[model samples]
Target chain A: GLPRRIIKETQRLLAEPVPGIKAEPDESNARYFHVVIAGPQDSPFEGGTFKLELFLPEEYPMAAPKVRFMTKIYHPNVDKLGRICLDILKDKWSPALQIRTVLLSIQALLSAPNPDDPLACDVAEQWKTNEAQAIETARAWTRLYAMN
Target chain B: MQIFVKTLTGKTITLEVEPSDTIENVKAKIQDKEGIPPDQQRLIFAGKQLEDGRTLSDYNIQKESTLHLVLRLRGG
Candidate 1:
């Protein structure tokens, strides 16, 4: 079985696309998805667009989906390697979640960075103590380093 | 019976349900209403996690009572 649920999800996602995000299946792997997310308004990532990749394994829903940023970004919660520190990606994962919501949550994370738990330690420190400077650097990084 | 959903976003959604409805059935309804997948909803009555195969009545849920809900996040 081709993970009927995943196919069904893929169909729904394509039919009812989320704003500022698009997920296209990989050329060789039906289980892999290539994603593009437009940074949200009023956030440091606002003008930047980011790429990400998702893999749906055999045990998919039973196991959380594997997603990592393909784009370089500077943030408290996202590491240099683009690993994220979102709770749902780990212990809080539930099979009931779908790709649309996952991408939406990631977008939300851009607007509200939780400096308390940082995958990028120094950035987290800067975010907590010097909010203004952190925001500026984040914006600069988004404009220069991230995908235009 | 009433089942209250407490989303992490601090929004509360209430479901007026029946005892005959199985936990799995309730999950389906939540999925339809919230756009969350059925497997993503974690519902609890009192302090115990509600099992999907069981009926709502089995939990002795009552009218005006609240069942808390939590949604799972996907991806890293």
Candidate 2:
């Protein structure tokens, strides 16, 4: 049941375009996915691209998908290893959430990063205390990792 | 209380907490402030679920405590 649901939803996400986000099947497995999201404008992350890894859980809608960043990005919320700290991917997950909505939320995050709580304390501190430098660092990282 | 929230796109936000609030309340505040769609947010405290409408008092959350919020991403 879980696999079937995953396949069906995966097809649905790929069939329709969600603003700022796109998904493709993983090369090795039907149950795994790779996602690309366009950075939002008016944010330090503008003009950037981000990659994510998606894996279905055995619980299907009952449990949240395991998502992690595949690209190395400079942000307060993501660790060097690409662990993201969004809440939906963790405890507050509801069975009603879908892939498209999830991706859209991520797109929103690019435009508004929260520095008060961060996965990377140094980045968060820099973002809060020295926003210009943070923006520059993020821009540089985009050129290095998200470009091309 | 302070919680750390990270988005799939590598964005992070920190939220300060009131002792009277619950984890769910904190999440609602995050959605309100950050514009993250309510359906897409998930909150985890000490690697456990923070039930809807459950208060921080129930979890014994104190000042300077840290929690994590991650965006839900499903596929394949």
Candidate 3:
């Protein structure tokens, strides 16, 4: 049985869509959502579009939603498999946070890449040792893989 | 017309407006409800900022459209 909260959230997301983000629930499984996030300006990812997936489990609201990038990106916080390193998606998660907030946070991460806590260690090392080259690589990656 | 203004904090404010109403008019409505000054209010829709002199119709805003509100401070 679908929870009323999930239904209401889905309705609200459609009615009042967020800027630079879109989430559509799967017809076969409401718990699965197809997501797209436009790259933020002033970042290496600008002018790019990122694809992602979000899935809510039975324990959602109590458990954080599972999210992963499908589009390739070159950032320290994102791994080769597109796994993201975001605290809010892990131990820092709280039930009060909704899909809108989660997606917004991910967009913000693109604007500010954090190398201190990273999922891609090699990328993080490059970011820390040679930021210019890392940014250039990230830009190239976006142009090659993330452009519309 | 009925529209929505959503804050970064996720709180929403519904307003009664018209297609001919200036963006400044919409800001004034928000100020009346939230006490935020018109100058401090920055309304955005579909990724574009709403200018004071422009009417809602200029932006193609229709009924039930949602606008995002970002507050501006003096020193950041």
Candidate 4:
């Protein structure tokens, strides 16, 4: 389900972890990878290690990998089911990209929540109306779901 | 010069700028203050991509003028 090139990318990931991010492929299914991302500092999610799942379909690079949060994240761009609403995850995906870039983009999204284009309308509305309350709730969720 | 940015969250942020300054300078400032990447931010003024190479005077971005900022997507 993966091009031989993907093996090289996977090896590179283990050889040099990208800062606060760690990932590994499933032993049973190489197409599936598990990722742990450290929340961006200064953001509401700081100090949390959020889990995510990623799997490349049969289409390989022809189709973007299915990525979703395993740990519940109270982000405007992330729904309750853990789905994300990032353009790069969908229409903006490129064959030239690999897991590293996409994961980095996810971390970037964590750093700056794009409320203008949100997966959860209610969260976005809360963000727009009262940013303080929204951030407080986000912090609360981080403490509840992402930490002990 | 002063440019008003209608941020993605629907909040207006007024930034002090100069006509002779490059848009990149403004982007850097916004990135520092707003926590968004300067490269990933798409600044639109007067319904067009505000060219980073050009100056504020080039786009006629005067005081109290509003611009829209969105996340730049991979155009592939």
Candidate 5:
């Protein structure tokens, strides 16, 4: 049986979508969603649209959704394979946190990339050592990879 | 004529509205229910900010459409 929560959440995502975000379930898989997150204003990623994939596991609600960036990004918290370094996606995940909150948190992370946590070591190093240069690199990557 | 408003805390408040109602009118109605003032309230839909002067029809808001409400942070 499909969880009623998933159905309601899916309906709500369509009827009341988060600003600057879009998520649609896959036709073949109810648990999978194709997502797009717009870059936050004033961030190096501004003017770019990022693609991501999200999947709710069987143990979801008890487990966090699996989310990974499909679009390449130049940020310390995201790696080449698009794995993210975020607390809620790991040990901090709770049943109470819904998909919307998860995506919102991810979007917020893009605005304030966390170099201290460091997913990509070199990116983190540049972010910490030469902030301006790192931001420009991020901007260049967004233009090269994320722009249409 | 029915619309939904979602708060930051995940509460959904359903309100009756008309297609002709302006954003300010809807804000006043929200004030009547949530006690949040019109000026302090910001409504957003489809990634666009709802202007005070625009009608719901201008945005093509349909029945059961949910609008996210963002309250301005204030410190007293």
Candidate 6:
């Protein structure tokens, strides 16, 4: 019952298509989701595509789903394994954060990664000291992993 | 005393610790050195959560002992 609801809603989102993103079935599992978000204009990630994995928790919206980057992205708030560092995904989470909102937040995170609080300290330092290189790496990874 | 350390992620940070230090103490030291906060730290050795006051000696930690420091991940 829970999986059905999650799949149905996820399918609906896939069919409708958000303004800047898309969600689809994962290759291996119907219960799992693969999402793509287009980088917003005026951001370093612009024109790039980022991929994410979303797994519905048994508790669904009551408990946060497991989300991580499927694509190799270079961002201060994102680790080597594509783990994101966002409070809403952690302790600040609320039931109101739907799949669409979460996707949008991730896109926003790409444009504005928080260096002060980072998942990858080295990446954060690089972002702070060499903004150009960091942006280039983000774009490079996007092209490598998401541009297929 | 020697306690085994393991990480869900591939990366592993091992340390040979003293018998008297608490897990919290080790966590604090890790926070100070690696910039990982205690709240975000998940310390597991052989699939068990190390308690605050548990000593490494109790777990058999000694010379060349390894303790894993796993980085916490945020779930969707």
Which regions in candidate 5 have their CA more than 4 angstroms from the true location?
A: B1-9, B12-76
Of the true interface contacts, the fraction found in model 1 is: 0.00
Given the true complex, what DockQ would model 5 score? Answer: 0.11
**Residue B53, candidate 5: how far off, in angstroms?**
31
Model 4 segments beyond 4 Å from truth? B1-76
Chain A TM-scores, candidates in order: 0.91, 0.89, 0.93, 0.92, 0.94, 0.80
lDDT, candidate 6, A29-76, per-residue tens: 665788877766655566667778877776766767678987777677
Per-model TM-score versus the true fold: 0.65, 0.63, 0.68, 0.66, 0.68, 0.57
Ranking by DockQ: 5, 3, 4, 1, 2, 6
Off by over 4 Å in 6: A3-5, A11-16, A26-30, B1-76
* Candidate 4, CAPRI quality class derived from DockQ: incorrect
Per residue, candidate 6 scores C-alpha lDDT tens digits across B9-76 of 22345555577878777888777756777767655432234555676766555665544433335310
Residue lDDT tens for model 2, A1-148? 3367677667776665555676788657766888887776455667767888888777767878878888778987887788888776777666556665566556656756668667789988887788899999998888888864
DockQ (CA atoms), all models: 0.04, 0.03, 0.11, 0.04, 0.11, 0.01
Query: Model 6: how far is A96 from its true place, Å?
Result: 2.6
- lDDT of model 2, residue B7: 33
Clashes of each: 2, 23, 0, 0, 0, 9
Model 6 is docked with a DockQ of 0.01
lDDT of each candidate versus the true structure: 0.71, 0.68, 0.77, 0.73, 0.77, 0.63
True contacts kept of each: 0.00, 0.00, 0.10, 0.00, 0.13, 0.00
The RMSD of every model to the true structure, in order and in angstroms, is 11.4, 12.7, 7.1, 11.3, 7.7, 16.8
